[PDB]
């Protein structure tokens, strides 16, 4: 699961091997630049302290004219110029070193990740169909996104900051042992707890978001399950139970979040307590050593400061090890993909290529099974020999594998037994790509790339001019719809052929295959949705180009099969019947039976959502008022310690003031712990119950909505669970964290500036000039430490959706062998974010080094002006130290706090969208009782002139004014083509869509005036695909009846009536057996039977069936239908199915054609007048 670190950096140039070495040398040199500034700070404060001690003695005596005072402070004013030169030198060196190290590591990352990305896509276009069938399609795309982002975050910049932190730690210890070791051993005795506190501080500062998603992991399943099955759920009326289950999950999630917030804030409070207790110990022992007359004050400042910076930087080194371990663990998979090579190399030019390509097909003893399900053997040997120009058709029921034979032809796989050959030699020694280009194949359901149609028809082969394009499309007879639409070669077809119709799509797909000019043509169901005349002209064109080529046609319509060369028949995988038309006529087999039968708006109204919980906000604002003013208190106490140690006094007065301030540090630590814990707890509680109540109300206002609001292209299931998962937790940052951060920063900086203006005026004005660049020096470094920006990966994947539409449409391009064109398209689509990445890699280094140098230059300028002010006697050294300490440390605290907060602008926009969802009222209300409530009914339905257009497809009408008359107990079958408005009449009944025109009378009562929930209560259906919920089977069937005490005798009675009682009573924990998502554990016929049992508990007066025997056994269809036939009396029953067994015994039968009712009446009347329903009956009987 992990790679070694030697193999991790293997795709690198000499230039990146130089970039990494120079960017770690400059990282060490930049890392050794803070303790070297502590040396200068110690020696400068020692100069200031020694001049000051000397000064008092001269003062009482007086009478010394001017030179004596001059010379005493002129030595100070002269020596501070040399120390300002030292500071400026360290500042310039740190500027150059930090720019070089950041820029060179980010350039090494950019070049390496570009080569990784190109090699991974080039390897994934060598990987067979079988690997796609075993692994995934969507997890592959998230593997690309996640693994590239994790490599870029792993070897990107964190390897530089790790070496910088190691250099800072080692330089700090070397300085702390070379100045004074007796203090460094005390702080080294402390320093494990210091490093542990810093490590856990950076740890819980790093993640900050994963606990919310692992708390919502248990509740989002119910969300995605209900939003996936929205129409069936509001068709049953089970809003209330799923609402209560969502509540039961959210209470647990909120309680674990409460525990998380309390524990994290206690941890950071204990971190602050340990920092200030380390100050109290360090300065108590330091002033013991100074008043002993053994150290100076500058020696104590240098050793302690140098030691503490080293310990916290080696603590802050901790996230880089985690990021690098994650990069190794994410790199192993991409290295596994780019390592392994298949047996069938689709780019090896060591394949063999024929020249005299003559059409001849040889199959002998061909056994093959799918590697997805290898336990089942579909094929048990097929032997064929097809000559040139021989139109071979294959007939049989669905399940024998005509599509299997087509996929076996193009070498998408290999047969486990035997040997296949094309014109003498076998496929197993000759080239795959040259063979793949010469076999033009149309599959069953083609896919069309969403480019212009000229490029689509160009996609067969490289150099095709428009004259061959026009000849091919006129052969395809697909020029009329080209002529009527604008942009006749410039029309961008939408996603998956949604812009055009199906017949135009299949005709231009035939064109797209014919532009290759192939040697063998293979059609698979080429006229599924096509009409009469266009299939006729397509088949005439197919016979126009069949004389030089070998052809195999698979189709259901026998109009295009009767004019073929050889007809054959599959049975159990084995080709059983052979010969021409009349040979199978006199053979009297299954084909004889077949032919015998056939003849923004929110502006701080986000506080309105949380006006109810005022006391949490009151104690939070109070604790932020206190906890903002703990940097100026630290400025006061630190400045007063050094102001004690500049002037002369008694030894006992110095010891008293030193002990008092080394106690005031510890008092500040305890107050910091208490107020920080209390603020963090109360803002955690307010934000958490805001997230809980807003998730509840957003879920309920989602569930009140119409079906037609859920079919919107902007309102998808993924977008709604994003608006419930990601954006519900983003509304706490617009109010609670915003008030905490604004109040904390005001009491951090305003009182520091006011104290500074009272004590020293001129220096406060100069520092107010230089202050915003130090604040930006806080925020930019804190943004670099923990996730600066993630828009570049979004731009990357938005340009790289070519990869997604290449992987999703892999089934066409493995036939077209057009891999190299897609690889070069990806290589030329990566090129612009490459330049954007290099531009960002220079600009970020420039601005980071500008702020990092402006810190040291602020030190130099502030202390030179303070030296002048002390020398001309307008303030003291205690006051310049107070002004500088308060303003600069307040600015860095403002940066470090205001970078920790989440953003406010996107939080405000997300709150505006959540308020948009909350405020909206649907056109119908499921909770209202108003309408027509009659006490009685009969059960007669009358449709008249009903037209319906889909709201997502307003230009395409699926209905053209149907009408229907249903009476009591009338088994009404609805037969038609796939996609002619079969479930549309169900959706018109169940109050999903209300039609724009038409009239529907339910027993002389119009449905538009009735109660909405009453119609949804009385009837009960079975879905087109059975969906169950994440519980047991007792709660699967128990969902059928709601607002009612569900009796278990009805449960076992319905399980016996649906003949699912056996499969339930066989299972261990029989009525408590936990079923996963959508019934993925148990089989399809069993969940179809439990869907029958779930509809059966409703006892509906109106019953609808939509494909009641899609996947079900022949003995199970009778035991399903016996309960139906004993219970079809009393209730109106309407069954829609493709199997004719429930259609023969039906009462009245209605055939549809493009939405229009063609034939209606009794079954014998439709069997008398031979129309289209006779051809529907003529399928497989006899």
């Amino acid at each position, epitope marked *: 699961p992990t790679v070694s670190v030697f193999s991790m950096f293997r795709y690198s140039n000499w230039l990146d091997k130089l970039y990494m070495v120079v960017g770690t040398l400059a990282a060490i040199i930049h890392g050794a630049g803070l303790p070297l500034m502590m040396l200068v700070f110690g020696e400068m404060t020692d100069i200031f302290a*020694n001049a000051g*001690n*000397l000064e*008092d*003695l*001269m003062s*009482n*005596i007086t009478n010394r004219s001017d030179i004596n005072d001059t010379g*005493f402070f002129m*030595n100070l004013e002269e020596d501070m110029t040399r120390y300002a030169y030292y500071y400026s030198g360290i500042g310039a060196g740190v500027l150059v070193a930090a720019y070089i190290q950041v820029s060179f590591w980010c350039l090494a990352a950019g070049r390496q990740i570009h080569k990784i990305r190109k090699q991974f896509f080039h390897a994934i276009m060598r990987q067979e169909i079988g690997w796609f069938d075993v692994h995934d399609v969507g997890e592959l795309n998230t593997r690309l996104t996640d693994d590239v982002s994790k490599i870029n975050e792993g070897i990107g910049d964190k390897i530089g900051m790790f070496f910088q932190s190691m250099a800072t730690f080692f330089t700090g210890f070397i300085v702390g042992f070379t100045r004074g070791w007796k203090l460094t051993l005390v702080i080294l005795a402390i320093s494990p707890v210091l490093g542990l506190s810093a490590a856990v501080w950076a740890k819980i500062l790093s993640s900050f978001t994963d606990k919310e998603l692992l708390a919502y992991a248990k509740a989002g399943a119910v969300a995605e399950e209900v939003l996936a099955a929205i129409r069936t759920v509001i068709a049953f009326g089970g809003q209330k139970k799923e609402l209560e289950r969502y509540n039961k999950n959210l209470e647990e999630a909120k309680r674990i979040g409460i525990k998380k917030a309390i524990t994290a804030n206690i941890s950071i409070g204990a971190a602050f307590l340990l920092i200030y207790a380390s100050y109290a110990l360090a300065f108590w022992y330091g002033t013991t050593l*100074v*008043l002993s*007359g*053994e*150290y*100076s004050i500058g020696q104590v400042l240098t050793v302690f400061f140098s030691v503490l910076i080293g310990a916290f930087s080696v603590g802050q080194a901790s996230p880089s090890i985690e990021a690098f371990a994650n990069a190794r663990g994410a790199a192993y998979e991409i290295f596994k993909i780019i390592d392994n090579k298949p047996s069938i190399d689709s780019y090896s030019k060591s394949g063999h290529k024929p020249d005299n390509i003559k059409g001849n097909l040889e199959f002998r003893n061909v056994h093959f099974s799918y590697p997805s399900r290898k336990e089942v053997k579909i094929l048990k040997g097929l032997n064929l020999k097809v000559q040139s120009g021989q139109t071979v058709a294959l007939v049989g029921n669905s399940g024998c594998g005509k599509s299997t034979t087509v996929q076996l032809m193009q070498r998408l796989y290999d047969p486990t037994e035997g040997m296949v050959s094309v014109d003498g030699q076998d496929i197993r020694t000759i080239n795959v790509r040259f063979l793949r280009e010469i076999i033009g194949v149309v599959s069953q359901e083609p896919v069309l790339f969403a480019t212009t149609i000229a490029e689509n028809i160009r996609y067969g082969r490289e150099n095709v001019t428009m004259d061959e394009i026009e000849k091919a499309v006129k052969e395809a007879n697909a020029y009329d719809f080209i002529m009527k639409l604008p942009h006749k070669f410039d029309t961008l077809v939408g996603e998956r052929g949604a812009q055009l119709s199906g017949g135009q799509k299949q005709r231009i797909a035939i064109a797209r295959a014919l532009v290759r000019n192939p040697k063998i043509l293979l059609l698979d169901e080429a006229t599924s949705a096509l009409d009469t005349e266009s299939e006729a002209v397509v088949q005439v064109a197919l016979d126009k180009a069949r004389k030089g080529r070998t052809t195999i046609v698979i189709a259901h319509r026998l109009s295009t099969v009767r004019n073929a060369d050889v007809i054959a028949g599959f049975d159990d995988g084995v080709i059983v019947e052979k010969g021409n038309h009349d040979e199978l006529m006199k053979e009297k087999g299954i084909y004889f039976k077949l032919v015998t039968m056939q003849t923004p708006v929110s502006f701080w109204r986000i506080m309105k959502l949380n006006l109810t919980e005022w006391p949490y906000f009151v104690v939070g604002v109070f604790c932020a008022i206190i906890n903002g003013g703990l940097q100026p208190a630290f400025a006061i106490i630190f400045s007063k310690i050094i102001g004690v*140690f500049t002037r*002369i*006094d*008694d*030894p006992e*007065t*110095k010891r008293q003031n030193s002990n008092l301030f080394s106690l005031l540090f510890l008092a500040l630590g305890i107050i910091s712990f208490i107020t920080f814990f209390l603020q963090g707890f109360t803002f955690g509680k307010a934000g958490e119950i805001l997230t809980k109540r807003l998730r509840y109300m957003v879920f309920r206002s989602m569930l009140r909505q119409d079906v037609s609001w859920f079919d919107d292209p902007k309102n998808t299931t993924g977008a709604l669970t994003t608006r419930l998962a990601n954006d519900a937790a983003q509304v706490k940052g617009a109010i609670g964290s915003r008030l905490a951060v604004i109040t904390q920063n005001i009491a951090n900086l305003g009182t520091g500036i006011i104290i500074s203006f009272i004590y020293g005026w001129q220096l406060t004005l100069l520092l107010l000039a230089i202050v915003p660049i130090i604040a930006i020096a806080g925020v930019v470094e804190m943004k670099m430490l923990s996730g600066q920006a993630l828009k570049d990966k979004k731009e990357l994947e938005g340009a790289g959706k070519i990869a997604t539409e290449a992987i999703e449409n892999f089934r066409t391009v493995v036939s077209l062998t057009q891999e190299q064109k897609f690889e070069h398209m990806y290589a030329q689509s990566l090129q612009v974010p490459y330049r954007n990445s290099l531009r960002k890699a220079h600009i970020f280094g420039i601005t980071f080094s500008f702020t990092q140098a402006m810190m040291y230059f602020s030190y130099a300028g502030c202390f030179r002006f303070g030296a002048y002010l002390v020398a001309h006697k307008l303030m003291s050294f205690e006051d310049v130290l107070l002004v500088f300490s308060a303003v600069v440390f307040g600015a860095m605290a403002v940066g470090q706090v205001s970078s920790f907060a989440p953003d406010y602008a996107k939080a405000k926009i997300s709150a505006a969208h959540i308020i948009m969802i909350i405020e909206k009222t649907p056109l119908i209300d499921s909770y209202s009782t108003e309408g027509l409530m009659p006490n009685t009914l009969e059960g007669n339905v009358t449709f008249g002139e009903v037209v319906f257009n889909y709201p997502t497809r307003p230009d395409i009408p699926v209905l053209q004014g149907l009408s229907l008359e249903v009476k009591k107990g009338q088994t009404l079958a609805l037969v038609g083509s796939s996609g002619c408005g079969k479930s549309t009449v169900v959706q018109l009944l169940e109050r999903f869509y209300d039609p724009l025109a038409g009239k529907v009378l339910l027993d002389g009562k119009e449905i538009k005036r009735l109660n909405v929930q009453w119609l949804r209560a009385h009837l009960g259906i079975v879905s087109q695909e059975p969906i169950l919920f994440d519980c047991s089977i007792a709660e699967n069937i128990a969902y059928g009846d709601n607002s009612r005490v569900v009796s278990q005798e009805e449960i076992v009675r319905a399980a016996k009536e649906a003949n699912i009682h056996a499969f339930i009573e066989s299972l261990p924990n029989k009525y408590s057996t936990k079923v996963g998502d959508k019934g993925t554990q148990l089989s399809g016929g069993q969940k179809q039977r439990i869907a029958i049992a779930r509809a059966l508990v409703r006892q509906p007066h109106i019953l609808l069936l939509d494909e009641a025997t899609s996947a079900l056994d022949t003995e199970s269809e009778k035991v399903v239908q016996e309960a139906l036939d004993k219970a079809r009396e009393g209730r109106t029953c309407i069954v829609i199915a493709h199997r004719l067994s429930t259609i023969q015994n039906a009462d009245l039968i209605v055939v549809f054609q493009n939405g229009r009712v063609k034939e209606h009446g009794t079954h014998q009347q439709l069997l008398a007048q031979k129309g289209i329903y006779f051809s529907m009956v003529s399928v497989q009987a006899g």
Partner: antibody, heavy 122, light 114 residues
Framework: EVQLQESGPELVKTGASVKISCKASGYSFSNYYIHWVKQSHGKSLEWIGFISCYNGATFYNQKFKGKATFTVDNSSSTAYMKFNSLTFEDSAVYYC???????????????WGQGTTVTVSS | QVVMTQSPLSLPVSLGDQASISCRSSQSLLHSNGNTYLHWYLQKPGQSPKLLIYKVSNRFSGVPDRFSGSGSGTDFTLKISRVEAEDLGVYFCSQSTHIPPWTFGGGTKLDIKR
């Protein structure tokens, strides 16, 4: 162990120039002042001046300004006093004593040298 | 300039009893604090002047428990109780708390009292 020790006796000529040296050993040399005081034969001690012993800022009594000069040496950690233009009145015994720079003037001169003895003759 | 005036210039103590030396200022040696600074040194013949008492009541470290200072204002006293054969040599009294004349005292020898 804190020990300031000085040079041996001198036997200079009148009008010459002499240099006497207080070498400090056993403590951190860079904090404490060095005060040079003078005892004649059978009189009270008299304070000559002090040298700051960190950077080298001197301060002399008004009787002795110009006829004495203090230097320091941080490498070997000594303090030198140079007399120029000796007369007979400058024949005495000279002592060096330290005094801490943090709480200066509120602390006694706690450690004293053994004192050199300068004998001006002609 | 203040001038200390150490009142005996000889003090014929015996061997094994009490002796008292008395420093006496010319100005009130009370600082603006509550403290009074005058320090008492012993000087042996030919060796370095050790320190005995500082800030008249207190005591240095290493000096035995016989010596004790007292007095205030402008009248200060050192007292040796049970004088041994080791405490012979002059005793002088620094300082002025008004510096930089930084004055000193005369001295007081001790005898054997024949």
């Amino acid at each position: 162990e804190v020990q300031l020790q000085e040079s041996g006796p001198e036997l200079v000529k009148t009008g010459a120039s002499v240099k006497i040296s207080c070498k400090a050993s056993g403590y951190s040399f860079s904090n404490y002042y060095i005060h040079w005081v003078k005892q004649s034969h059978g009189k009270s001690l008299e304070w000559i001046g002090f040298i700051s012993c960190y950077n080298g800022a001197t301060f002399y009594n008004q009787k002795f300004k110009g006829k004495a000069t203090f230097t320091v040496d941080n490498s070997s950690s000594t303090a030198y006093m140079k007399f120029n233009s000796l007369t007979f009145e400058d024949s005495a015994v000279y002592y060096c004593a330290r005094l801490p720079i943090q709480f200066g003037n509120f602390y006694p001169m706690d450690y004293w040298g053994q004192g050199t003895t300068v004998t001006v003759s002609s | 300039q203040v001038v200390m005036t150490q009142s005996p210039l000889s003090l014929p103590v015996s061997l094994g009893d009490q002796a008292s030396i008395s420093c006496r200022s010319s100005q009130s040696l009370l600082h603006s604090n509550g403290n009074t600074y005058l320090h008492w040194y012993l000087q042996k013949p030919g060796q370095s002047p050790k320190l005995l008492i500082y800030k008249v009541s207190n005591r240095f470290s290493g000096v035995p428990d016989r010596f004790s200072g007292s007095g205030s204002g402008t009248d200060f006293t050192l007292k040796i109780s049970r004088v041994e054969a080791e405490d012979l040599g002059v005793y002088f009294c620094s300082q002025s708390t008004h510096i930089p004349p930084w004055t000193f005292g005369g001295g007081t020898k001790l005898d054997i009292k024949r």
